[PDB]
Ligand binder design. Structure first.
Ligand code: CLA
Ligand code: CLA
Ligand code: CLA
Ligand code: CLA
Ligand code: CLA
Ligand code: CLA
Ligand code: CLA
Ligand code: CLA
Ligand SMILES: CCCCCCCCCCCCCCCC(=O)OC[C@H](COP(=O)(O)OC[C@@H](O)CO)OC(=O)CCCCCCCCCCCCCCC
Ligand SMILES: CC1=C(C/C=C(\C)CCC[C@H](C)CCC[C@H](C)CCCC(C)C)C(=O)c2ccccc2C1=O
Ligand code: SF4
Ligand code: SF4
Ligand code: SF4
Lengths: 165, 40, 73, 742, 124, 80, 144
């Protein structure tokens, strides 16, 4: 398979790893009674463990010789072989949220610079104003492009202080 | 009351509330969707 | 395992370059010390004024960079 | 003569949230609001520096008094939480039945992101984090047997916490004492000696006689905890007590007729340790607290208040003058009734020293049942109370220096002791400098000698028990005297105060509780390392105090204040001349000294005291390897650090894995601190300029101008992260090691 | 101006210091070095003999210990020589002069080596 | 000795002279500023290089500048 | 106004002494003398540590470096409203009057003073270091 890896569903090491993890919990479960709270907690952990190994194999992760899932980061390989949900799709999930936070903060900063005392709005947050901007940040990718195309995203060099050179 | 709600709008208090909320949201998602490593 | 350590090495190269490059390009002056070139490559500081100016010389930037070079190597 | 009386002001400060919404209100400099990020840091650094906000001593005193109620309120919440978690999230009831085979636990983690592995199998049908604070052993000693009793204490703690916070509000906003009230030092000492300490000890002795002793007597007899009479039944039924202690059949008549020998059944002088629990006899502690109560109630009648009798502290000081010291103690009464910093300097110095004494006395004479054989608790308590003492002692140096800069006044100190100490400060510091060099060469140099000889294959040339010997004969002589005390110099004591002096070991649950501690060459060498490290810490701190106001380098240091970065690159460079900077350097040396103290304690106890007892004898945890290995640096690196770090670095996948993570996390924080200690703000401010340019380019530059930390804050951040990382590293290392092999 | 103490200003202390060859003016610098040399050379053999690498050898210990002390006297004499060269280049006491110090250093060598030899004779 | 220079941006506020711990600076008559006085550095053999004068100067950039130079007993601040 | 002449006979403030005073430098290189007239007996702080009492009338103290004399001058001027002066005294007996140099304290502009080390340009108008290279020694562009 990709880069000599093998699917985790077909990996002997992957299957062996699950047995060891469950075996460790089973050993601890012997010293407790069937209905006792420690027994219930240990079995709940065992159910989660079995579900975890079942889900990762179902998702089609590739496993190395160690039996551990390995992620695929090249967009071409990820999209060609159905690994887009490992790095590629998460990539755009992050950039949407990260830009959301950045864009909302930038809007608040610009909004309060027109006030009488801008610095007072940075240590005592204008929560009504902050809340309104938070909800409107869901469309930042559209808003950001329009500023880029309108020439208003960036400031002109003549207004930026620099040191002597 | 105006002054007290002004106090609750200071940076440390807002940060406490916002991070308590953000942490709660992330913890509760992992409670109902445990061990997420990939998107399916 | 090779993936993670190679990005550690890139972190070291870029941070060491940042300190050395910043030292070179600010060697002649900065907003904090506009006339730095009048004081030479190596000098103690410019005193506690203007907020405090410890390790402001280009020589001190090199001194900081050596720690990062050792960490990177 | 001024009458000692209550004096307050009605409604001095209105209770309002107006100032909560005005950050920096307390200071004239900061009340105008931020223009740079330095304002934000300055807000917090000056928050509790009350005397820098005003010169009125009455206003300062009132803030101090109510801040103290706030501290007490927080402590009551903390105590209430400990009792509550013992009532609701512990295995205390199960532990009471089988104290040796169950590990105390009072913290349970939620199952989330896989962290429930930290709920280890600690026994008693329970899962949780194993605690080392020793609360279980404290609770058993006081006679607590059920979760209900723990729960009720937690509720009462919250009621006290609310009362403390009410008192703080009440005594600042409603009835604030006047300055004359605070200055009744004679009355305060009478009440704090006779009342706080005397009555407190008497009351606790009352609890021990009526609750602790009867309950612990039945527990040590194998009686089941649930079959033991409830404490109020013991109080109301003299017949039940008379069964346990026959002298109770005579009531309180023997006390009032001076037939005190009747109470020998519960007021004893046994000494040694209870062979069942491995702790001190509770009948000995009860007699101790009775005797202490009488002593402090007598002490509380020494000072004159309102009825002629008693001493004037001012008259005592002024009388004690001699030929060699000029005016002597004149002016000290005025200093100590007008400067909080002077008072805090003395109180921190001894409170910190007291903490270190507690660390030594509790390991050697374990006062709680089943404490001695809980090696995890023994190591933790000693380490904890040693560190508190060290930190407190450094604070004494800091606030002595603050008094020197802010409160010292030459007009009131002419040719008295304080004035004369200043006038030969060069003689004091120069000699102390020489002693440190002598101690450094002849203590650490011995290790270097030993490492070199061992590396060259000349073990016969080493300082060791099998070679050139350095016996601590003075310490050995003292041990023998204390072991023989019951025969001659303490005739009424059955046994010596501690088993460390000599004699036979006490084993509880197949493990050594305490046994004699032998002192060889390795012990001689490490004690003179302790002498070296303490003397240097004193040197740094004392120098900062004596030169706080001036020196040959900076003739007017007093005008520059307690805390300033330097006085410029001139005179060859004057970085870190201020007194604050001496506290900064003193912290590092305090950390260096107490690290060796606790490493000494950890290795010595594992090697020569702690261990398992069987038919073949006593096998110590590290097999007695301290004597021959602890005399070389390589011995400490190999046999202590490398060997004993095995537990912590192998804890991943177990309940102790949290200590493995913190072990690495603490190494990180320590190394992170070197960034602040090695560099200077001038570099960082110039870096921030470029980053600001990028934010300007994108119209996202903040209105509060970013600034690099001040020079002094860079040092404060550096040392704070250094200490936290260094201490937290050893914390993880100790707990993972001792909870695993203990 | 200066702080006067019994240690700094006492009659017994002052009289003792004046008697020492270092402070005994009116004596030839060479004689001063010999007296100072003898005193220091004699004591120097002690630690080397009792704590050297050959201390446990029955008879070699005395020779090695005193022989090493003699080597230290030579090093010390060289230190005195160069000190005079540096300190005095361009007054009441002849000792503090270019010629006087050189004579004083020479006396220290002769006295020091003799003191080491005398110590060896006492041992054996 | 250190090198101290006064530049024509001085406003004659006198704060550098008041702050000098060595009495290196003094005020002299001038006509280039409203105060009609300018700072002067007549005795630079006594300058220790502390730069308290630079800390006190209000103008932007500084009107009094210290360049650390050769070290003597005076400039080093030694009392021995 | 004329340069005062030092009077060695002047009494000194009452002071028991300390270890922070003069060293061998005073005997071989130079020391400093400060004198002032006191309106009354009063306690002041010595720059070398400790408290001393100034005698009513003339006072005289000796210090090891110039900064010590000026540090006491600042204290006396600001806290007691006095007018001290000090000298530099050489081992051969020569006396050099120092402060105030012309009888008027430097912070007050006085006629007859000649500007020194005054550049008739801004800091930003200094030349680049390359223009003063190989001038015979190390020198800043601010030295031209
Ligand atoms: C960070 C740099 C980087 C690197 C080193 C690679 C490397 C690689 N990519 Mg990837 N790729 C990247 C970024 C990168 N990619 C990005 C940012 C995108 C999104 C725009 C893609 C989109 C992409 C696609 C769509 C494909 C690859 C493919 C490949 C592999 C073979 C083609 C090749 O010669 O690529 C060397 C890379 C470069 C010279 C840089 C530009 C590469 C472009 C974007 C793709 C070229 C595809 C190529 C013409 C396909 C030929 C047929 C194929 C069957 C071999 C190779 C391992 C191919 C593959 O093996 O898919 C399974 C493939 O089909 N990549
Ligand atoms: C570079 C840093 C980094 C990264 C990329 C990750 C990534 C991840 N960590 Mg890890 N982690 C890190 C640092 C990091 N970690 C550190 C420093 C620690 C120590 C505190 C941990 C401790 C830790 C634990 C204990 C766990 C993880 C887990 C996870 C996974 C969480 C996925 C999730 O919650 O989806 C939820 C889905 C989302 C979409 C989240 C965002 C939700 C918003 C509402 C989306 C809005 C979109 C419009 C993910 C693979 C968990 C796991 O299962 O890993 C396999 C897990 O149990 N991490
Ligand atoms: C020093 C004081 C202190 C500390 C550090 C803790 C710490 C803790 N407590 Mg405890 N607690 C305390 C005092 C304290 N408590 C007091 C005084 C009471 C009585 C009112 C309680 C009553 C209490 C309960 C009832 C519970 C805890 C629980 C907890 C845990 C989870 C808390 C959490 O995440 O809340 C969530 C965070 C926010 C709401 C913010 C945590 C280990 C929980 C626990 O042990 O769960 C197993 C739990 O259920 N505590
Ligand atoms: C609800 C009642 C109330 C109100 C409205 C006020 C109002 C006022 N008080 Mg008063 N006070 C109160 C209760 C109250 N006080 C109590 C209970 C006490 C006893 C402690 C005091 C003691 C007191 C003093 C000694 C002083 C005031 C002062 C003030 C003024 C400024 C307050 C300020 O800036 O607070 C903002 C401050 C905070 C929010 C800090 C809170 C600190 C507490 C102790 C909790 C800290 C706990 C926390 C967990 C610590 C660890 C943190 C860690 C986990 C990160 C203002 C008029 C000051 C003044 O200038 O008066 C003229 C002043 O000097 N008060
Ligand atoms: C017998 C009387 C008595 C007692 C028991 C105390 C006890 C205490 N005083 Mg002292 N004090 C007294 C008389 C007394 N004082 C007198 C007469 C004066 C005036 C000269 C002072 C002036 C004074 C000051 C200025 C300060 C103290 C402080 C303290 C506390 C030190 C910390 C400690 O050990 O906590 C141990 C804690 C406990 C044992 C908890 C005990 C709680 C209960 C309610 C008893 C508190 C004592 C109180 C006088 C009871 C009546 C109060 C009121 C309802 C009438 C402590 C609670 C310091 C402090 O922290 O104040 C807040 C402090 O700053 N005291
Ligand atoms: C502070 C510590 C303390 C306290 C509180 C107690 C308390 C007690 N001891 Mg103990 N004891 C102590 C220290 C203490 N002891 C010490 C140090 C020793 C060693 C010398 C002893 C040795 C000892 C012995 C040998 C005995 C006791 C006994 C007792 C009990 C009876 C005492 C008695 O006869 O009182 C006599 C009377 C009083 C104390 C006065 C009571 C006044 C009341 C409270 C006034 C209420 C007035 C009010 C208006 C009422 C309003 C009502 C409302 C509903 C309207 C009692 C529970 C006896 C017992 O039976 O123990 C089980 C007993 O035999 N003790
Ligand atoms: C009874 C104890 C006591 C008291 C009442 C005080 C009181 C005071 N001290 Mg003193 N001090 C003490 C002990 C004490 N000190 C000790 C033990 C030391 C040695 C370390 C010092 C060293 C010291 C110095 C060097 C200075 C003071 C200063 C002050 C004053 C201002 C404090 C302030 O504003 O803090 C504001 C509080 C903070 C900024 C918070 C600091 C938090 C630290 C850095 C980290 C805590 C980490 C935490 C425990 C664990 C990690 C948590 C994290 C992971 C979240 C005030 C009068 C200052 C002054 O100028 O006084 C005139 C000053 O400069 N103290
Ligand atoms: C391992 C690191 C280290 C070492 C070796 C030292 C050494 C010293 N420190 Mg320092 N210090 C350190 C770290 C260290 N420090 C750090 C990290 C800090 C920052 C917090 C400081 C902060 C600090 C302060 C603030 C002070 C010291 C002081 C001292 C001195 C104590 C007196 C003494 O023992 O002298 C004897 C020297 C030693 C014990 C060092 C080893 C000596 C070897 C074994 C001798 C070898 C001899 C041999 C003939 C060599 C020949 C070589 C060749 C020519 C052939 C000493 C010079 C104190 C001082 O100066 O006291 C007077 C003092 O005030 N230190
Ligand atoms: C020993 C010194 C005793 C000293 C002793 O007993 O002094 C006692 C001696 C008695 O003086 P007075 O009789 O005048 O005391 C009157 C008192 O009421 C204080 O005013 O005090 C002094 O001489 C003060 C200065 C002593 C300075 C001592 C310098 C040497 C210190 C050495 C430190 C060694 C520490 C070892 C620790 C184990
Ligand atoms: C690293 C370093 C800096 C740079 C460090 C800085 C500027 C401190 C940075 C602190 C935080 C991270 C920045 C401010 C954070 C805000 C409160 C916003 C937080 C936002 C979150 C809540 C999301 C110095 O300024 C310095 C000064 C003197 C000696 C050494 C050093 C030094 O080593
Ligand atoms: S602390 Fe900083 S500014 Fe002050 S002299 Fe030292 S290096 Fe210069
Ligand atoms: S550097 Fe110091 S001594 Fe020199 S002129 Fe400036 S303030 Fe005066
Ligand atoms: S402080 Fe600056 S502006 Fe003021 S007189 Fe001095 S050089 Fe001129």
């Amino acid at each position: 398979d990709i880069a000599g890896l093998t699917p985790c569903s077909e990996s002997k090491a992957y299957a062996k790893l699950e047995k060891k993890e469950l075996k460790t919990l089973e050993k601890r479960l012997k010293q407790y009674e069937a209905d006792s709270a420690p027994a219930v907690a240990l079995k709940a952990t065992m159910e989660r463990t079995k579900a975890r190994f079942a889900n990762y194999a179902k998702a089609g992760l590739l496993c190395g010789n160690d039996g551990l899932p390995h992620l695929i980061a090249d967009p071409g390989l990820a999209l060609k072989y159905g690994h887009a949900g490992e790095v590629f799709i998460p990539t755009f999930g992050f950039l949407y949220v990260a830009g959301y936070i950045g864009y909302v903060g930038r809007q608040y900063l610009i909004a309060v610079k027109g006030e009488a005392k801008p610095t007072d709005k940075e240590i005592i947050i204008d929560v009504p104003l902050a809340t309104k901007l938070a909800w409107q940040g869901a469309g930042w990718p559209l808003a950001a492009v329009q500023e880029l195309q309108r020439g208003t995203l960036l400031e002109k060099e003549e207004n930026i202080t620099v040191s002597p050179r | 009351m105006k002054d007290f709600t002004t106090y609750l709008s200071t940076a440390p208090v807002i940060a406490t509330i916002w991070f308590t909320f953000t942490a709660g949201l992330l913890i509760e998602i992992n409670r109902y969707f445990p061990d997420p490593l990939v998107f399916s | 395992g090779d993936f993670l350590v190679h990005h550690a090495i890139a972190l070291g190269l870029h941070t060491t370059t940042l300190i050395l490059v910043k030292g070179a390009l600010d060697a002649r002056g900065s907003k904090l010390m506009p006339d730095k070139k009048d004081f030479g490559y190596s000098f103690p500081c410019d005193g506690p004024g203007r907020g405090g100016t410890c390790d402001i010389s280009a020589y001190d930037a090199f001194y900081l960079a050596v720690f990062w070079m050792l960490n990177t190597i | 003569a001024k009458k000692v009386k209550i004096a307050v002001d009605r409604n001095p400060v209105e209770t309002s949230f107006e100032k909560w919404a005005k950050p920096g209100h307390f200071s004239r400099t900061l009340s105008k609001g931020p223009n740079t990020t330095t304002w934000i840091w300055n807000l917090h650094a000056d928050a509790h520096d009350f005397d820098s906000h005003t010169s009125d001593l009455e206003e300062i005193s009132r803030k101090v008094f109510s801040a103290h109620f706030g501290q007490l309120g927080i402590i009551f919440i903390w105590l209430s939480g400990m009792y509550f978690h013992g009532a609701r999230f512990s295995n205390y009831e199960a532990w009471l039945s089988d104290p040796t085979h169950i590990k105390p636990s009072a913290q349970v983690v939620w199952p989330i992101v896989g962290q429930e592995i930290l709920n280890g199998d600690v026994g008693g049908g329970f899962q949780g984090i194993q605690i080392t604070s020793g609360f279980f052993q404290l609770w058993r000693a006081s006679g607590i047997t059920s979760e209900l009793q723990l729960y009720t204490t937690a509720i009462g703690g919250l009621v006290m916490a609310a009362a403390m916070f009410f008192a703080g509000w009440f005594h600042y906003h409603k009835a604030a004492p006047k300055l004359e009230w605070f200055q009744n030092v004679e009355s305060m000492l009478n009440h704090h000696l006779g009342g706080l300490l005397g009555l407190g000890s008497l009351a606790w002795a009352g609890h021990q006689i009526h609750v602790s002793l009867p309950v612990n007597k039945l527990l040590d007899a194998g009686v089941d905890p649930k079959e033991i009479p409830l404490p109020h039944d013991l109080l109301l039924n003299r017949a039940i007590m008379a069964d346990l202690y026959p002298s109770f059949a005579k009531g309180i008549a023997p006390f009032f007729t001076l037939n005190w020998s009747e109470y020998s059944d519960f007021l004893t002088f046994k000494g040694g340790l209870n062979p069942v629990t491995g702790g001190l006899w509770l009948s000995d502690t009860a007699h101790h607290h009775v005797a202490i109560a009488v002593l402090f109630l007598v002490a509380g009648h020494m000072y004159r208040t309102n009825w002629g009798i008693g001493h004037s502290m001012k008259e005592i000081l002024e009388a004690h003058r001699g030929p060699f010291t000029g005016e002597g103690h004149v002016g000290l009464y005025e200093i100590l009734t007008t400067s909080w910093h002077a008072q805090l300097a003395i109180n921190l110095a001894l409170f910190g020293s007291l903490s270190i004494i507690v660390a030594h006395h509790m390991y050697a004479m374990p006062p709680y049942p089943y404490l001695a054989t809980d090696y995890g608790t023994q190591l933790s308590l000693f380490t904890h109370h040693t560190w508190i003492g060290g930190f407190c002692i450094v604070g004494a140096g800091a606030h002595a220096a603050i008094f020197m800069v802010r409160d010292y006044d030459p007009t009131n100190n002419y040719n008295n002791l304080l004035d004369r100490v200043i006038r030969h400060r060069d003689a004091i510091i120069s000699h102390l400098n020489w002693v440190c060099i002598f101690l450094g060469f002849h203590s650490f140099g011995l290790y270097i000698h030993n490492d070199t000889m061992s590396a060259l294959g000349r073990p016969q040339d080493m300082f060791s028990d099998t070679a050139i010997q350095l016996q601590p004969v003075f310490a050995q002589w003292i041990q023998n005297t204390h072991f023989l005390a019951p025969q001659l110099t303490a005739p009424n004591a059955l046994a010596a105060t501690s088993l460390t002096w000599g004699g036979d070991l006490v084993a509880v649950g197949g493990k050594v509780a305490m046994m004699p501690i032998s002192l060889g060459t390795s012990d001689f060498m490490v004690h003179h390392i302790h002498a070296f490290t303490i003397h240097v810490t004193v040197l740094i701190l004392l120098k900062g105090v004596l030169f706080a106001r001036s020196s040959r380098l900076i003739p007017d240091k007093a005008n520059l204040g307690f805390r300033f970065p330097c006085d410029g690159p001139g005179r060859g460079g004057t970085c870190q001349v201020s007194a604050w900077d001496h506290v900064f350097l003193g912290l590092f040396w305090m950390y260096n000294s107490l690290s060796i103290v606790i490493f000494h304690f950890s290795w010595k106890m594992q090697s020569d005291v702690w261990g398992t007892v069987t038919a073949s004898g006593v096998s110590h945890i590290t097999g007695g390897n301290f004597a021959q290995s602890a005399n070389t640096i390589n011995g400490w690196l190999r046999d202590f650090l490398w060997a004993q770090s095995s537990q912590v670095i192998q804890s991943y996948g177990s309940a102790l894995s949290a200590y493995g993570l913190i072990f690495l996390g603490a190494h990180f924080v320590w190394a992170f601190s070197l960034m602040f200690l090695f560099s200077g703000r001038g570099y960082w401010q110039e870096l921030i300029e470029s980053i600001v340019w990028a934010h300007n380019k994108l119209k996202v530059a903040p209105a509060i101008q970013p600034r690099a930390l001040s020079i002094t804050q860079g040092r404060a951040v550096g040392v704070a992260h250094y200490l936290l990382g260094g201490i937290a590293t050893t914390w993880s290392f100790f707990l993972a090691r001792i909870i695993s092999v203990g | 101006g200066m702080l006067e103490t019994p240690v700094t200003s006492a009659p017994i202390v002052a009289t003792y210091l004046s008697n020492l060859p270092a402070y005994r003016t009116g004596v030839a610098p060479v004689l001063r070095g010999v007296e100072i040399g003898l005193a220091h050379g004699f004591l120097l053999a002690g630690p080397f003999i009792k704590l050297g690498p050959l201390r446990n050898v029955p008879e070699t210990a005395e020779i090695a210990g005193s022989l090493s002390a003699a080597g230290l006297v030579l090093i010390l004499a060289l230190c005195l020589s160069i000190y005079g060269s540096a300190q005095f280049q361009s007054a009441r006491d002849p000792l503090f002069s270019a010629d006087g110090w050189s004579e004083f250093a020479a006396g220290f060598l002769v006295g020091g080596e003799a003191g080491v030899a005398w110590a060896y004779v006492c041992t054996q | 000795a250190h090198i101290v220079k006064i530049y024509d941006t001085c406003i004659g506020c006198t704060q550098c002279v008041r702050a000098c711990p060595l009495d290196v600076l003094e005020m002299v008559p001038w006509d280039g500023c409203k105060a009609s006085q300018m700072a002067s550095a007549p005795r630079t053999e006594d300058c220790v290089g502390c730069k308290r004068c630079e800390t006190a100067c209000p103008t932007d950039f500084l009107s009094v500048r210290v360049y650390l130079g050769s070290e003597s007993t005076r400039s080093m601040g030694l009392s021995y | 106004w004329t340069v005062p002449t030092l009077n060695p006979d002047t009494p000194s403030p009452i002071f028991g002494g300390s270890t922070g005073g003069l060293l061998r430098k005073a005997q071989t290189e130079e020391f400093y003398v400060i004198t002032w007239e006191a309106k009354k007996e009063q306690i002041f702080e010595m720059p070398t540590g400790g408290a001393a009492i100034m005698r009513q009338g003339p006072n005289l103290l000796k210090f090891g470096k110039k900064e010590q004399c000026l540090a006491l001058t600042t204290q006396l001027r600001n806290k007691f409203k006095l007018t001290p002066c000090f000298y530099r005294v050489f081992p051969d007996g020569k006396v050099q009057y120092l402060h105030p140099a012309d009888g008027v304290y430097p912070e007050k502009v006085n006629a007859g003073r000649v500007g020194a080390n005054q550049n008739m340009r801004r800091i930003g108008q200094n030349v680049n270091p390359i223009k003063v290279k190989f001038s015979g020694r190390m020198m800043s562009p601010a030295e031209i």
